[PDB]
Amino acid sequence: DSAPGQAAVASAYQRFEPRAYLRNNYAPPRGDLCNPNGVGPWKLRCLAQTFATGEVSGRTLIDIGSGPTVYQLLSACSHFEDITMTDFLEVNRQELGRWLQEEPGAFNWSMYSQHACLIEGKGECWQDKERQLRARVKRVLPIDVHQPQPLGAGSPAPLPADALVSAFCLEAVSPDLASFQRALDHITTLLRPGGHLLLIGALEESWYLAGEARLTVVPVSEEEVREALVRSGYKVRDLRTYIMPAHLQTGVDDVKGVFFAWAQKV
C-alpha cells in the first residue's frame, strides 16, 4: 500500500509556487528577524548553537529537500567544504540557481545571512558568509525521499555523507507515519555511521496549501519524532519545540508548532 498517498503529493507539488512560496513565507513580515521570540530567529538559533559545539563537522554535507531556500545552511557552511543541495522539482533547483549566479530578481536572503553572523558572534559580515556558501555548494541534484535510494543509482553525490540537514521535508511530503518512518530510513542510507542529522519540521500538521492543492500529510508529534529516530539507528542528542504563536496561524495550514532535532547515527 501507501504509494497512492505519495502520488497525491507529487501531484500537489506540480502546482508549486517557487517565488510565491518565498514571498509568503520568507519575505517580511512573515519573516521578521527583528522579533527575537519569533520563528526565523529560533530556527537559525538552533542551527548556530548546534554547530557551535564543533561536534558536527566534516567533509561532505547533503541538504535534503532544500526547496528554494538556504537559511538552513548559513551557520553550516563554515564546517563543511562540500555541500550537496537537493529538491524534487526542477523549478526549485532553478530558483536556487538564480541565486548561486547572483542575478537580480533572485531572492534577497541577505537579512537571514546577517542574523546568522550575529548569532555566531565571530565578527563575520553577511557578504563573506554568502560567498562561503556559494563556494561550498558543489551540486544541486534531484531528490525523492520515498525511493530506496533517494538520489538514484550511481548518483554524483560523494557518498556516504558526513552530515545531513533537512528543513520541513519529511512531515510535509509524507501522508502517513509509515511513509515518514520509511523516508527517514531512506536518507540515513546516505549518512555515514557516526555522522549527524539535523532536522526541522512541522508539528501536528495535517494539511497545507502547495500552490492550489490542499494536500494531506501526517500530524506528527515531538514524541513520535523521537521514537522514529531511534527506530532508524540514531541517538537523539537534542530535541526542541517551538509553540506556533497566534501571530502566524493564517488558514494556510494547521501547523501548531515546529521542532528541531540533532541525532547521530549508530
Ligand X SMILES: Nc1ncnc2c1ncn2[C@@H]1O[C@H](CN(CCC[C@H]2CNCc3c2ccc(Cl)c3Cl)CC[C@H](N)C(=O)O)[C@@H](O)[C@H]1O
CB of residue 153 to ligand SAH, shortest distance in Å: 17
> Which x/- pattern, by CB under 8 A, does the window 9-48 give for a copy of itself?
------------------------xx-x------------
SS3 assignment, position 118: helix
Q: Which residues have CB under 8 Å from 177's CB, separation 6+?
A: 218, 220, 224, 228
Query: Which triple of cell numbers denotes residue 161?
Result: 555523507
Does the bond joining 219 to the residue before it have cis omega, within 30 degrees of 0? no
Q: C-alpha 179: how far from its chain's center? A: 18
Residue with the CB atom nearest ligand SAH in the bound state: 67
Number of residues that bind ligand X (CB under 6 A): 27
Instruction: Please select the residue that binds ligand SAH; options are 65, 76, 117, 133, rule is CB under 6 A.
Output: 65
Indicate whether 208 belongs to the interface with K ion (CB under 5 A): yes
Give the whole-angstrom CA distance, residue 264 versus residue 266: 7
Please say which residue, 131 or 235, places its beta carbon nearer to a copy of itself. 131
Partner in contact with 124, chosen from K ion, a copy of itself, ligand X, none, beta carbon below 5 to 8 Å by kind:
a copy of itself
Structural Rg of the chain based on CA atoms: 17
AA letter at 96: L
Does the bond joining 29 to the residue before it have cis omega, within 30 degrees of 0? yes
Helix (H) / strand (E) element for 223: namely helix 222-230
Give the whole-angstrom CA distance, residue 261 versus residue 225: 9
> Is the separation of the CB atoms in 99 and 25 below 8 Å?
no
DSSP conformation letters of 68-108: T--HHHHTTGGG-SEEEEEES-HHHHHHHHHHHTT-TTS--
CB of residue 35 to a copy of itself, shortest distance in Å: 8
Number of residues that bind ligand SAH (CB under 6 A): 19
> Which x/- pattern, by CB under 8 A, does the window 73-112 give for a copy of itself?
----------------------------------------
CB of residue 111 to a copy of itself, shortest distance in Å: 8
Binding residues for octopamine: 205, 253
Indicate whether 203 belongs to the interface with ligand X (CB under 6 A): no
> Which x/- pattern, by CB under 5 A, does the window 139-178 give for K ion?
-----------------------------x----------
> Is the separation of the CB atoms in 259 and 242 below 8 Å?
yes
Instruction: Please select the residue that binds ligand SAH; options are 81, 144, 185, 253, rule is CB under 6 A.
Output: 144
Please report, as residue ranges, which positions from 62 to 91 form the binding site for ligand X (by CB under 6 A).
65-67, 69, 72, 87-89
Q: Which residues have CB under 8 Å from 168's CB, separation 6+?
A: 65, 67, 200, 201, 202
Binding residues for S-adenosyl-L-methionine: 21, 26, 65-66, 71, 87, 92, 144-145, 167
AA letter at 204: E
Residues near ligand X (CB under 6 A) are 9, 13, 25, 65-67, 69, 72, 87-89, 92, 143-146, 167-169, 172-173, 202, 205, 208, 253, 255, 258
Tell me which residues touch K ion (CB under 5 A): 168, 208
